[PDB]
Amino acid sequence: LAFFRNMYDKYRDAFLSHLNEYSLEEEIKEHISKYYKLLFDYNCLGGKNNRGILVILIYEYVKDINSSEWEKAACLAWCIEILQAAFLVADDIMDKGEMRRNKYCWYLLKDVETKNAVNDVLLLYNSIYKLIEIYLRNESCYVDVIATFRDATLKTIIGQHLDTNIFSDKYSREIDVNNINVPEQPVIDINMINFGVYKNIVIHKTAYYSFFLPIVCGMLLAGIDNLIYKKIEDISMLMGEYFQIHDDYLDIFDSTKTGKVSDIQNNKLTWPLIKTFELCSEPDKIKIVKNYGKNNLACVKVIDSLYEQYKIRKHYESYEKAQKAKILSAINELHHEGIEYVLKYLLEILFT
Amino acid sequence: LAFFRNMYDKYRDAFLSHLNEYSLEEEIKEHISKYYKLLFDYNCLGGKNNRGILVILIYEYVKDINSSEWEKAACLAWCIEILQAAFLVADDIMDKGEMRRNKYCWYLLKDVETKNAVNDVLLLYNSIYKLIEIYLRNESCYVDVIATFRDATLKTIIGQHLDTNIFSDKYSREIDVNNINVPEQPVIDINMINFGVYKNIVIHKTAYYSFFLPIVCGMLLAGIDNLIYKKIEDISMLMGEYFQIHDDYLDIFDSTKTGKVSDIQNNKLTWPLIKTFELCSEPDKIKIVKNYGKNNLACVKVIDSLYEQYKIRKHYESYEKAQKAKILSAINELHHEGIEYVLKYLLEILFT
Ligand SMILES: CCCCCCCCCCOc1cc(O)cc(COc2cc(Cl)c(S(N)(=O)=O)cc2C(=O)O)c1
Numbered sequence: 001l002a003f004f005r006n007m008y009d010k011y012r013d014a015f016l017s018h019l020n021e022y023s024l025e026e027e028i029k030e031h032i033s034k035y036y037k038l039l040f041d042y043n044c045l046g047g048k049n050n051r052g053i054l055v056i057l058i059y060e061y062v063k064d065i066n067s068s069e070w071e072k073a074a075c076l077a078w079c080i081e082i083l084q085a086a087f088l089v090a091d092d093i094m095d096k097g098e099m100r101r102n103k104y105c106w107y108l109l110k111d112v113e114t115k116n117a118v119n120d121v122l123l124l125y126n127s128i129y130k131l132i133e134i135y136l137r138n139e140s141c142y143v144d145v146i147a148t149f150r151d152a153t154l155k156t157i158i159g160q161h162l163d164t165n166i167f168s169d170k171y172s173r174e175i176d177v178n179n180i181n182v183p184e185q186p187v188i189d190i191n192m193i194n195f196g197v198y199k200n201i202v203i204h205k206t207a208y209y210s211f212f213l214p215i216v217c218g219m220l221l222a223g224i225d226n227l228i229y230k231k232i233e234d235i236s237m238l239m240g241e242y243f244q245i246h247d248d249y250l251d252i253f254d255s256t257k258t259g260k261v262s263d264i265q266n267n268k269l270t271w272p273l274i275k276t277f278e279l280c281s282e283p284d285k286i287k288i289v290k291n292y293g294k295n296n297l298a299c300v301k302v303i304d305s306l307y308e309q310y311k312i313r314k315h316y317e318s319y320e321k322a323q324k325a326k327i328l329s330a331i332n333e334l335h336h337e338g339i340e341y342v343l344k345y346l347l348e349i350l351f352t
Numbered sequence: 353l354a355f356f357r358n359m360y361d362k363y364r365d366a367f368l369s370h371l372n373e374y375s376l377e378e379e380i381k382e383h384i385s386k387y388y389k390l391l392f393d394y395n396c397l398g399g400k401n402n403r404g405i406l407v408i409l410i411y412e413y414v415k416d417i418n419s420s421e422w423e424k425a426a427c428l429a430w431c432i433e434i435l436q437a438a439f440l441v442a443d444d445i446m447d448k449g450e451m452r453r454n455k456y457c458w459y460l461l462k463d464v465e466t467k468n469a470v471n472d473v474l475l476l477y478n479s480i481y482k483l484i485e486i487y488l489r490n491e492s493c494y495v496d497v498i499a500t501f502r503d504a505t506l507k508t509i510i511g512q513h514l515d516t517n518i519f520s521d522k523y524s525r526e527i528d529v530n531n532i533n534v535p536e537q538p539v540i541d542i543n544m545i546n547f548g549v550y551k552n553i554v555i556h557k558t559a560y561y562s563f564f565l566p567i568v569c570g571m572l573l574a575g576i577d578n579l580i581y582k583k584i585e586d587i588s589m590l591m592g593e594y595f596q597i598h599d600d601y602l603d604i605f606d607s608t609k610t611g612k613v614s615d616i617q618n619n620k621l622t623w624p625l626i627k628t629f630e631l632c633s634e635p636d637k638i639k640i641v642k643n644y645g646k647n648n649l650a651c652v653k654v655i656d657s658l659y660e661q662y663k664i665r666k667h668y669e670s671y672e673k674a675q676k677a678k679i680l681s682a683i684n685e686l687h688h689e690g691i692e693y694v695l696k697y698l699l700e701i702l703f704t
């Protein structure tokens with residue numbers, strides 16, 4: 001079952017040995033494999049592996065499975081860990097990040113820098129489909145597996161776009177393709193602070209690839225199309241909202257435990273923000289507008305101090321409990337003991 | 353035939369309405385479509401469309417074509433034009449470009465910056481595979497087409513990696529995962545200034561997606577695996593070299609015609625550099641090492657002086673004629689009239 005962590009070496013080396021079939025001077029090949037080995041190890045290891053665990057479990061509890069068929073599923077499982085590694089490198093470039101899984105972000109290393117990092121997220125991304133071909137080309141589900149990766153990816157790209165631009169000038173007129181020189185001054189848009197817009201962003205940014213895709217993958221590989229998928233997809237949207245709100249909470253509340261340091265500085269629409277904005281006073285809205293989305297520690301400190309004043313922790317647990325219950329309620333209306341066993345177990349182990 | 357200029361709006365709108373049926377608010381939906389309309393139009397238009405045209409021609413000259421079949425072939429043609437959109441957004445980030453196709457580089461605009469640009473190369477790259485599916489799900493060549501796009505993209509990712517790092521320290525060691533502070537100053541490595549290495553870089557960075565892929569897509573659609581594909585691969589390699597070397601020679605010899613600003617400044621391994629290193633005395637080798645790769649006006653003027661002095665235009669004319677001959681010679685060993693003509697057309701229209 002969770003031996004999964006051991007087959008990592010063979011899926012990474014399967015792809016490295018494909019690179020090594022290229023017509024290149026033997027000296028270049030040694031430099032190529034040395035660089036890309038560190039690219040895969042540095043950025044795929046060190047996670048909780050929840051999304052990969054999720055595939056292996058759904059595969060087993062939809063359900064007698066020989067060792068040849070566990071190889072195909074462990075490949076899907078690592079393909080989703082690779083997929084998150086490629087999201088991490090991109091996010092850390094995009095969000096001017098500093099620390100990830102308690103190491104320097106990949107793009108900050110002066111031996112790689114941005115130029116290499118941008119090129120590396122596309123290598124990692126494409127390595128997924130190569131692994132999928134190498135291990136599943138002859139399955140009946142091959143075309144649908146790669147269509148689920150492609151479509152889940154598209155959705156989280158759109159979700160990443162919204163997360164980055166929800167507050168920007170071009171969403172409050174016309175993109176000026178002649179301005180390379182007046183850098184927009186980031187500012188909140190009070191008209192966008194609400195949960196309708198939050199769920200739109202976070203469903204797309206989190207729920208499809210962290211939950212819909214690993215489940216649907218585990219089920220396409222087992223043999224299932226059926227009207228159960230749409231019920232799985234609704235639970236997914238609930239677990240994605242529930243996971244992202246927890247992630248927003250962690251951003252402001254310990255880097256040693258989370259492994260990261262940024263949402264106020266980066267002018268993001270977050271749960272702590274929409275919470276504060278509905279309960280605070282009219283003076284307090286003016287301070288939020290004035291200080292949100294700057295790099296001043298003084299401006300961040302103002303926003304953090306407001307989050308304590310209004311005790312947003314207490315509100316979080318209120319949300320967490322009510323939502324945990326809404327997910328369990330949604331799992332039980334699914335009518336499938338095996339998959340219901342995986343989702344409940346996952347719901348317990350999501351943050352550990 | 354070359355009417356495929358007219359079909360752009362429908363393949364672009366095809367992808368845009370895939371996004372437009374996402375579960376998002378109505379106001380959010382229209383912001384997305386306004387931004388991604390400009391994304392496609394800014395970066396797929398304004399080029400010469402040599403790769404797109406090559407697909408349409410090869411398809412027609414391997415053969416009797418109905419309207420439905422043209423709608424598929426012109427999809428593959430814009431897919432490769434979108435592919436080259438993604439390759440620019442990315443090449444211009446990594447090389448800090450200023451002008452691409454007589455406009456500002458996409459990442460340089462203040463409404464997009466680097467954070468949106470990185471996210472946009474993944475959207476453009478992935479939109480290709482949505483388009484191929486919409487129009488080719490039910491064709492027998494469908495899987496062969498998606499795999500050709502994938503293995504081509506992988507090779508140019510590797511070539512672009514070598515092009516970026518052949519002169520850096522890690523290619524002369526190991527990567528310091530502790531260094532985020534001491535930046536690497538760009539320098540020349542004389543062990544890498546040879547045509548063996550350059551052919552490795554250029555073939556991967558250019559030959560596969562610029563030639564092999566658009567030709568293979570044409571043939572696959574036409575129904576042909578066969579040993580002719582191996583012959584197309586070596587032609588492709590001779591034409592990739594030919595085309596990059598011409599590009600190199602234009603970098604020193606006007607943004608009116610080329611549409612872009614920089615190889616000396618940017619420490620690039622180019623054919624002028626390699627040739628000049630063969631012909632020159634070793635006191636001039638020392639000048640090169642001292643002046644190449646410096647963001648300094650005196651320094652590129654010294655390297656320019658050296659290209660003029662060792663008569664680089666005269667040697668480019670020689671190379672160009674001998675290489676053109678060897679490509680025509682390979683073309684004739686094809687033993688297929690329709691492709692031979694297209695490759696003769698292409699070899700004449702390459703710079704126009
Ligand atoms: C294949 C990439 C194609 C281009 C994609 C560009 C957009 C990528 C967007 C990824 O978006 C994210 C948004 C977020 O709010 C957070 C994250 C990161 O979430 C994490 C979640 C988990 Cl469970 C874990 S883990 N592996 O330590 O257990 C890690 C991350 C993480 O950032 O490391 C990514």
Ligand SMILES: CCCCCCCCCCOc1cc(O)cc(COc2cc(Cl)c(S(N)(=O)=O)cc2C(=O)O)c1
Binds near residue numbers: 558
């Ligand atoms: C799907 C992208 C995944 C990440 C890829 C990162 C690396 C992208 C590398 C693209 O590599 C190139 C290498 C080169 O030496 C040159 C180029 C561009 O060359 C051009 C040649 C021509 Cl004829 C033309 S055009 N369409 O304007 O008539 C354009 C390009 C081009 O710059 O667009 C791209």
